[PDB]
mmCIF file of C-alpha atoms and ligand atoms in Angstrom:
data_model
loop_
_atom_site.group_PDB
_atom_site.id
_atom_site.type_symbol
_atom_site.label_atom_id
_atom_site.label_comp_id
_atom_site.label_asym_id
_atom_site.label_seq_id
_atom_site.Cartn_x
_atom_site.Cartn_y
_atom_site.Cartn_z
ATOM 1 C CA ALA I 1 133.537 203.102 -133.261
ATOM 2 C CA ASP I 2 136.140 201.556 -130.965
ATOM 3 C CA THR I 3 136.417 202.660 -127.333
ATOM 4 C CA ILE I 4 140.035 203.051 -126.264
ATOM 5 C CA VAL I 5 141.741 203.817 -122.941
ATOM 6 C CA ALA I 6 145.507 203.888 -123.216
ATOM 7 C CA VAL I 7 148.861 204.694 -121.681
ATOM 8 C CA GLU I 8 151.293 205.866 -124.348
ATOM 9 C CA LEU I 9 155.078 205.963 -124.664
ATOM 10 C CA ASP I 10 155.214 208.680 -127.325
ATOM 11 C CA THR I 11 158.719 208.901 -128.789
ATOM 12 C CA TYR I 12 158.007 211.400 -131.584
ATOM 13 C CA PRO I 13 156.446 214.707 -130.463
ATOM 14 C CA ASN I 14 153.661 215.998 -132.716
ATOM 15 C CA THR I 15 153.138 219.459 -131.250
ATOM 16 C CA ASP I 16 150.356 220.213 -133.753
ATOM 17 C CA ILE I 17 148.058 217.727 -131.962
ATOM 18 C CA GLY I 18 148.881 218.689 -128.371
ATOM 19 C CA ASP I 19 152.071 216.703 -127.815
ATOM 20 C CA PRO I 20 154.766 218.435 -125.751
ATOM 21 C CA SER I 21 157.887 219.411 -127.658
ATOM 22 C CA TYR I 22 159.701 216.463 -125.999
ATOM 23 C CA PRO I 23 159.143 212.685 -126.032
ATOM 24 C CA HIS I 24 156.743 211.846 -123.253
ATOM 25 C CA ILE I 25 154.362 209.416 -121.591
ATOM 26 C CA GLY I 26 150.655 210.031 -121.280
ATOM 27 C CA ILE I 27 147.132 208.905 -120.451
ATOM 28 C CA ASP I 28 144.655 208.828 -123.352
ATOM 29 C CA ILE I 29 140.938 208.665 -122.586
ATOM 30 C CA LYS I 30 139.295 208.018 -125.985
ATOM 31 C CA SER I 31 141.659 210.410 -127.843
ATOM 32 C CA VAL I 32 145.319 210.775 -128.846
ATOM 33 C CA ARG I 33 145.269 214.227 -127.227
ATOM 34 C CA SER I 34 146.512 212.902 -123.884
ATOM 35 C CA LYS I 35 144.534 214.122 -120.894
ATOM 36 C CA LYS I 36 147.803 214.218 -118.898
ATOM 37 C CA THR I 37 151.456 213.891 -119.996
ATOM 38 C CA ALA I 38 154.903 213.714 -118.388
ATOM 39 C CA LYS I 39 158.410 214.245 -119.755
ATOM 40 C CA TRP I 40 160.130 210.968 -120.649
ATOM 41 C CA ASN I 41 163.888 210.601 -121.216
ATOM 42 C CA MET I 42 163.674 207.803 -123.769
ATOM 43 C CA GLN I 43 166.904 205.819 -124.229
ATOM 44 C CA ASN I 44 167.493 204.662 -127.812
ATOM 45 C CA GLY I 45 168.755 201.075 -127.722
ATOM 46 C CA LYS I 46 168.005 200.245 -124.072
ATOM 47 C CA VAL I 47 165.267 198.161 -122.474
ATOM 48 C CA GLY I 48 162.710 200.230 -120.588
ATOM 49 C CA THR I 49 159.837 199.085 -118.406
ATOM 50 C CA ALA I 50 156.306 200.451 -118.066
ATOM 51 C CA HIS I 51 153.902 199.970 -115.145
ATOM 52 C CA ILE I 52 150.200 200.840 -115.216
ATOM 53 C CA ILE I 53 147.950 200.719 -112.146
ATOM 54 C CA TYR I 54 144.271 201.410 -111.525
ATOM 55 C CA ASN I 55 141.524 200.678 -109.011
ATOM 56 C CA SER I 56 137.817 201.518 -108.896
ATOM 57 C CA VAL I 57 138.014 203.063 -105.386
ATOM 58 C CA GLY I 58 140.731 205.677 -106.111
ATOM 59 C CA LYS I 59 139.325 206.152 -109.650
ATOM 60 C CA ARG I 60 142.754 207.314 -110.832
ATOM 61 C CA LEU I 61 144.809 205.668 -113.578
ATOM 62 C CA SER I 62 148.580 205.987 -113.181
ATOM 63 C CA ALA I 63 151.702 204.955 -115.091
ATOM 64 C CA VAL I 64 155.441 204.827 -114.342
ATOM 65 C CA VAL I 65 158.172 204.272 -116.951
ATOM 66 C CA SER I 66 161.839 203.688 -116.191
ATOM 67 C CA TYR I 67 165.165 202.377 -117.530
ATOM 68 C CA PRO I 68 167.904 200.733 -115.394
ATOM 69 C CA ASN I 69 170.155 203.321 -113.621
ATOM 70 C CA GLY I 70 167.660 206.034 -114.679
ATOM 71 C CA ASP I 71 165.162 208.285 -112.841
ATOM 72 C CA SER I 72 161.572 207.242 -113.744
ATOM 73 C CA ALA I 73 158.769 209.274 -115.359
ATOM 74 C CA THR I 74 155.313 209.274 -113.782
ATOM 75 C CA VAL I 75 151.920 210.409 -115.061
ATOM 76 C CA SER I 76 148.477 210.199 -113.471
ATOM 77 C CA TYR I 77 144.874 211.105 -114.238
ATOM 78 C CA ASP I 78 141.636 211.082 -112.236
ATOM 79 C CA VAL I 79 139.189 208.883 -114.161
ATOM 80 C CA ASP I 80 136.430 206.367 -113.423
ATOM 81 C CA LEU I 81 137.086 203.826 -116.180
ATOM 82 C CA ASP I 82 133.684 202.224 -115.547
ATOM 83 C CA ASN I 83 132.160 205.278 -117.258
ATOM 84 C CA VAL I 84 134.262 205.063 -120.448
ATOM 85 C CA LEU I 85 134.869 201.312 -120.833
ATOM 86 C CA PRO I 86 132.315 198.463 -121.246
ATOM 87 C CA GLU I 87 131.953 195.701 -118.577
ATOM 88 C CA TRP I 88 133.981 193.207 -120.658
ATOM 89 C CA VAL I 89 137.183 194.407 -122.377
ATOM 90 C CA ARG I 90 140.387 193.158 -124.009
ATOM 91 C CA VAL I 91 143.807 194.476 -123.038
ATOM 92 C CA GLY I 92 146.771 194.727 -125.348
ATOM 93 C CA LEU I 93 149.890 196.403 -126.644
ATOM 94 C CA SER I 94 150.081 198.576 -129.755
ATOM 95 C CA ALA I 95 152.819 200.369 -131.640
ATOM 96 C CA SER I 96 153.465 202.406 -134.750
ATOM 97 C CA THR I 97 156.178 203.831 -136.990
ATOM 98 C CA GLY I 98 155.403 206.453 -139.617
ATOM 99 C CA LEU I 99 157.585 208.994 -141.401
ATOM 100 C CA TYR I 100 160.308 208.198 -138.870
ATOM 101 C CA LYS I 101 160.901 204.718 -137.499
ATOM 102 C CA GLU I 102 161.985 202.632 -134.508
ATOM 103 C CA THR I 103 161.820 199.035 -133.364
ATOM 104 C CA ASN I 104 158.840 198.358 -131.095
ATOM 105 C CA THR I 105 159.949 195.133 -129.434
ATOM 106 C CA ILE I 106 158.179 193.738 -126.372
ATOM 107 C CA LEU I 107 160.474 191.521 -124.314
ATOM 108 C CA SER I 108 157.882 190.716 -121.615
ATOM 109 C CA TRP I 109 154.267 191.548 -120.783
ATOM 110 C CA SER I 110 152.156 190.722 -117.722
ATOM 111 C CA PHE I 111 148.664 191.669 -116.602
ATOM 112 C CA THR I 112 146.431 191.167 -113.560
ATOM 113 C CA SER I 113 142.804 192.140 -112.931
ATOM 114 C CA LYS I 114 140.733 191.402 -109.821
ATOM 115 C CA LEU I 115 137.050 191.950 -109.050
ATOM 116 C CA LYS I 116 136.245 191.811 -105.340
ATOM 117 C CA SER I 117 132.578 191.296 -104.459
ATOM 118 C CA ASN I 118 130.633 191.663 -101.218
ATOM 119 C CA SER I 119 130.457 187.902 -100.596
ATOM 120 C CA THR I 120 132.975 186.040 -98.442
ATOM 121 C CA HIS I 121 134.890 184.441 -101.331
ATOM 122 C CA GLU I 122 135.064 187.882 -102.884
ATOM 123 C CA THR I 123 137.524 187.224 -105.710
ATOM 124 C CA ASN I 124 137.398 186.905 -109.471
ATOM 125 C CA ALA I 125 140.702 187.224 -111.269
ATOM 126 C CA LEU I 126 142.575 187.045 -114.551
ATOM 127 C CA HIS I 127 146.369 186.976 -114.735
ATOM 128 C CA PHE I 128 148.854 186.257 -117.494
ATOM 129 C CA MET I 129 152.542 186.801 -118.130
ATOM 130 C CA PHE I 130 154.831 186.432 -121.147
ATOM 131 C CA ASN I 131 158.581 186.330 -120.728
ATOM 132 C CA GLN I 132 159.029 184.097 -123.808
ATOM 133 C CA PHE I 133 157.023 184.566 -126.995
ATOM 134 C CA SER I 134 156.403 181.773 -129.492
ATOM 135 C CA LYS I 135 155.821 181.686 -133.238
ATOM 136 C CA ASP I 136 152.252 180.360 -132.982
ATOM 137 C CA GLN I 137 151.355 182.239 -129.784
ATOM 138 C CA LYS I 138 147.792 180.957 -129.540
ATOM 139 C CA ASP I 139 146.627 182.929 -126.484
ATOM 140 C CA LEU I 140 147.340 186.253 -128.265
ATOM 141 C CA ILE I 141 145.472 188.012 -131.072
ATOM 142 C CA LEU I 142 147.965 189.666 -133.411
ATOM 143 C CA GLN I 143 146.729 192.545 -135.572
ATOM 144 C CA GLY I 144 148.426 194.453 -138.358
ATOM 145 C CA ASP I 145 152.184 193.990 -138.597
ATOM 146 C CA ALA I 146 152.606 192.418 -135.146
ATOM 147 C CA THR I 147 154.562 189.149 -135.097
ATOM 148 C CA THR I 148 156.000 186.873 -132.415
ATOM 149 C CA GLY I 149 158.899 184.438 -132.086
ATOM 150 C CA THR I 150 161.797 186.522 -133.408
ATOM 151 C CA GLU I 151 164.378 186.002 -130.648
ATOM 152 C CA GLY I 152 161.328 184.883 -128.693
ATOM 153 C CA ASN I 153 160.094 188.488 -128.558
ATOM 154 C CA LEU I 154 156.891 190.189 -129.655
ATOM 155 C CA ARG I 155 157.457 192.730 -132.479
ATOM 156 C CA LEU I 156 154.533 195.196 -132.703
ATOM 157 C CA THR I 157 155.924 196.850 -135.804
ATOM 158 C CA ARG I 158 157.626 195.516 -138.911
ATOM 159 C CA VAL I 159 161.385 194.978 -138.581
ATOM 160 C CA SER I 160 163.699 193.905 -141.399
ATOM 161 C CA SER I 161 165.517 190.571 -141.306
ATOM 162 C CA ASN I 162 168.796 192.481 -140.829
ATOM 163 C CA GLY I 163 167.343 194.108 -137.691
ATOM 164 C CA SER I 164 166.522 197.500 -139.215
ATOM 165 C CA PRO I 165 163.093 198.929 -138.314
ATOM 166 C CA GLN I 166 160.646 199.767 -141.080
ATOM 167 C CA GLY I 167 158.465 202.847 -141.391
ATOM 168 C CA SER I 168 154.756 203.082 -142.153
ATOM 169 C CA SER I 169 153.965 200.152 -139.875
ATOM 170 C CA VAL I 170 151.411 199.458 -137.160
ATOM 171 C CA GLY I 171 150.707 196.421 -135.021
ATOM 172 C CA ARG I 172 148.959 195.262 -131.862
ATOM 173 C CA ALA I 173 148.789 192.205 -129.604
ATOM 174 C CA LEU I 174 145.602 191.566 -127.610
ATOM 175 C CA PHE I 175 145.128 189.008 -124.879
ATOM 176 C CA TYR I 176 142.734 186.471 -126.317
ATOM 177 C CA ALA I 177 140.441 186.015 -123.331
ATOM 178 C CA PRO I 178 138.102 188.923 -122.524
ATOM 179 C CA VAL I 179 138.635 190.674 -119.201
ATOM 180 C CA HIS I 180 135.853 191.338 -116.678
ATOM 181 C CA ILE I 181 136.402 194.840 -115.256
ATOM 182 C CA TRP I 182 132.924 195.560 -113.851
ATOM 183 C CA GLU I 183 130.454 193.429 -111.930
ATOM 184 C CA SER I 184 127.242 194.299 -110.093
ATOM 185 C CA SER I 185 128.258 192.591 -106.849
ATOM 186 C CA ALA I 186 131.773 194.080 -106.788
ATOM 187 C CA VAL I 187 132.952 196.291 -103.939
ATOM 188 C CA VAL I 188 136.375 196.983 -105.483
ATOM 189 C CA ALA I 189 137.907 196.405 -108.917
ATOM 190 C CA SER I 190 141.569 196.845 -109.800
ATOM 191 C CA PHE I 191 144.275 195.956 -112.299
ATOM 192 C CA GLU I 192 148.025 196.087 -112.927
ATOM 193 C CA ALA I 193 149.871 195.932 -116.247
ATOM 194 C CA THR I 194 153.625 195.619 -116.783
ATOM 195 C CA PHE I 195 155.714 195.384 -119.918
ATOM 196 C CA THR I 196 159.375 195.598 -120.887
ATOM 197 C CA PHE I 197 160.231 197.150 -124.236
ATOM 198 C CA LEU I 198 163.170 197.889 -126.523
ATOM 199 C CA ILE I 199 162.858 200.983 -128.717
ATOM 200 C CA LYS I 200 165.819 201.270 -131.098
ATOM 201 C CA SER I 201 166.327 203.323 -134.249
ATOM 202 C CA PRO I 202 169.139 204.410 -136.588
ATOM 203 C CA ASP I 203 167.377 207.795 -136.663
ATOM 204 C CA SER I 204 168.011 210.553 -134.144
ATOM 205 C CA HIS I 205 164.240 211.214 -134.296
ATOM 206 C CA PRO I 206 162.521 207.880 -133.584
ATOM 207 C CA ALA I 207 158.795 207.360 -134.118
ATOM 208 C CA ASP I 208 156.113 206.794 -133.334
ATOM 209 C CA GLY I 209 155.635 204.873 -130.141
ATOM 210 C CA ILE I 210 154.226 202.082 -128.013
ATOM 211 C CA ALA I 211 151.036 201.972 -125.947
ATOM 212 C CA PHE I 212 149.204 199.712 -123.565
ATOM 213 C CA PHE I 213 145.460 199.911 -123.962
ATOM 214 C CA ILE I 214 142.135 198.547 -122.768
ATOM 215 C CA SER I 215 139.323 198.456 -125.282
ATOM 216 C CA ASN I 216 136.129 196.796 -126.434
ATOM 217 C CA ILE I 217 136.590 193.076 -127.073
ATOM 218 C CA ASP I 218 135.969 193.512 -130.834
ATOM 219 C CA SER I 219 138.511 196.325 -131.250
ATOM 220 C CA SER I 220 140.660 196.437 -134.373
ATOM 221 C CA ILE I 221 143.406 198.648 -135.802
ATOM 222 C CA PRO I 222 141.620 201.684 -137.263
ATOM 223 C CA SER I 223 142.463 202.306 -140.912
ATOM 224 C CA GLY I 224 145.028 205.041 -141.428
ATOM 225 C CA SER I 225 146.198 204.618 -137.830
ATOM 226 C CA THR I 226 149.826 204.285 -138.925
ATOM 227 C CA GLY I 227 151.874 207.096 -137.463
ATOM 228 C CA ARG I 228 151.335 209.064 -134.245
ATOM 229 C CA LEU I 229 147.847 207.602 -133.973
ATOM 230 C CA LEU I 230 149.841 204.648 -132.562
ATOM 231 C CA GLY I 231 147.477 201.956 -133.845
ATOM 232 C CA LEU I 232 144.751 203.128 -131.455
ATOM 233 C CA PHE I 233 142.790 205.956 -133.014
ATOM 234 C CA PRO I 234 141.265 206.758 -136.424
ATOM 235 C CA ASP I 235 141.985 210.500 -136.114
ATOM 236 C CA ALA I 236 143.655 213.123 -133.923
ATOM 237 C CA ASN I 237 140.428 214.557 -132.475
HETATM 238 CA CA1 LIG S 301 153.513 211.622 -131.014
HETATM 239 CO CO1 LIG S 302 151.491 212.036 -127.303
#
């Protein structure tokens, strides 16, 4: 039932559902089967950073993922999000481990959306940024296994008290205020999203991955979404 638009950092390739044979980054429009992908040289144990940009004039959603001292990976897709998403939506982070595991730690997360109307004032906006997470992080909706406060970070998937990641885990963090992406009077709508992450695993085959996503305000973790479904989708269709 949920309506999901997402940018995915897919660390475990599942070639039987359309994934490339290599870890990658991709744009998902209402399906795990990414409309576009790009090769991603994931670095186990290092902090990477993901950037996601869109505007209603260009009508293309793009994402760039990079690690310090490393060439970045870029993926883009032509898409009018007004035709897939509702007027009011919630944005968030999601992550999953399945048969294989990894830590899905968010060290920082910022977001900006602006609606620009034909009138002279011309600006409606929502912006937030987390560089320090708290135990009772009231302005975030945590779903599934997601917790906050551990080393002031957001953990989207379950991690043991000794630091070891756990498998068969899924978790998301939604910003608690709804976001206004469409408006009748608007002449241009746009948004940016940024987040820093630490994926770490004792396995040479980490799984499953981390995604940013924009969805209906009542979205919840679909049941059985542990694994490559990344907490976003109920199936691989
Ligand atoms: Ca995958
Ligand atoms: Co994928």
